């Protein structure tokens, strides 16, 4: 690499740039819709939802940095299963499942993807992402503490919500596997950093180590 | 709070240990799963000293397997070492031992350069290789098996397989000054490092592994082999004493014949039962009492309060430190493993 030399790199960066900005976009509205569901923190959620909007602006600026055309059409079927499971769960008033999809599953996915990106990325893009990662780590802390205070009522639904959505993530990385290699990211390394971020969340929320192993493990991965 | 960071011998053992722990899903997996697995605290340890002090520890599974080195996954092997060290810091463990190959990888791949892991700066004063204590127990094991079998150590030939190593270099200085060994044979891969070890000691002949075995009364194995070799007893002298301190065993077969005495080297035995399940898998002769010496160093540092990187680097062990750590080892209830009979 060492050169965002095009015709290999620009083909692949097109999908990845579309995926990251959509996830930023999909995270942005996602965060606010909890404000209905959760009364007290409704102003905290808007702020955090804003952070996602500039994050998206900034990764759009990474589209300015290079002559790259994104495509949301491939990018939105990527989140289709993840989106629909959030859409349905919010309609039923299941706040506990809702926090898991966004605050834990999506942010750990962001954390992992940004940390692996930092070293390999184009010099200009490196600056912009190194700033974004410490926000995401706070994002995660929002769900961590809420579920911590509501552990005993939320535990049984948290287990259920993990079994259905965590497999999606295994599958999602495999679709992107060959693209991420083009940019100097290994598929294996991405999975490792998601598990570390995810297992750090679960442990603080209150799960014991034995539970954590079974739960992290879902998906044939 | 001391830490024990560790790994398994083989994918087969990972399969069995996974199912013994109850996770049937984990045992199904190939090398790829273990190459992306995160570190776990899988066991909590309480130990009582012979002085009566009580200390508490944790065991971290790194998820390294030596197969990864043969399969040229140096990228992966390094992550596993750094995630495990990072993991033990996040949990506020005051001193941790880098068991097995984790200490090897740390030196061999200049991981002191990469101390920023996930943005958390690794405080090297929170880790030890455990190698100082391992070198002592091996020297005490050679002395002890010499008397058990009626051998006069001071007129005997001892080969050190891995003599330029961290442990191997230390064993050679102790076998030189503290026990006055007859002859010293030096075996290794690199030649420059062997030449300076002969210059430091002022003694010892350098031979390959093929030529050193038939001329050795004592064979001390302390080499970083991923696999482990097949030795035929006809190549060896009678009697022959093999001390195999490697992980995995540098002896890929149980070498048995008339005059062949095999001791599992680098092991110590505590005087009180220990609350744990981990040494059960490690094939310890008595798993509630016995353990590896480098794990015992972490307990020793914790009993004494020497929160520091007591063993570090390579070729830095001195006799003064081996003596210190050995004093503390005896005083707290630990004894070298002896010949089985
Ligand atoms: C979702 C998650 C799923 C989780 C599920 C899993 C849950 C289950 C986990 C529960 C597990 C419970 C079991 C716990 C495991 C217990 C075991 C402990 O972990 S670990 C056990 C604790 N650890 C132990 O066992 C400690 C004992 N072991 C040791 O002390 C060390 O490993 C050592 C002695 C072997 C290394 O020595 P050291 O000095 O440190 O190494 P150096 O590099 O300095 O030395 C290198 C020199 O060696 C020479 N050399 C190399 N190759 C050759 C050759 N072919 N010919 C000749 N010579 C050779 C060579 O010359 C070289 O220099 P050069 O000439 O090459 O330059
Ligand atoms: Fe974001
Ligand atoms: Fe976010």
Numbering used by the authors:
A (entry chain B): 9 to 229
B (entry chain A): 1 to 341
How is this structure described in the published paper?
The earlier discovery of the pathway responsible for alkane biosynthesis in cyanobacteria allowed the conversion from solar energy to alkanes through photosynthesis, without providing external carbon sources. This two-step pathway utilizes two water-soluble enzymes, namely acyl-acyl carrier protein (acyl-ACP) reductase (AAR) and aldehyde-deformylating oxygenase (ADO). AAR catalyzes the first step of this pathway, reducing the substrate fatty acyl-ACP/fatty acyl-coenzyme A (acyl-CoA) into the corresponding aldehyde in a NADPH-dependent manner. Here we report the crystal structure of AAR from Synechococcus elongatus PCC 7942 (SeAAR) in its apo form (AARapo), together with three structures of AAR in complex with ADO from the same species of cyanobacteria (SeADO), in which AAR binds either substrate or substrate/cofactor.
We obtained the AARstearoyl-CoA–ADO structure using the AAR C294S mutant, which avoid spontaneous formation of the acyl-enzyme intermediate, and solved the structure at 3.01 Å resolution. In this structure, the entire stearoyl-CoA molecule occupies the long L-shaped channel of AAR. The CoA moiety occupies the same cleft in which NADPH was observed to bind in the AARNADPH–ADO structure. These changes result in a wider opening at the surface of the AAR molecule.
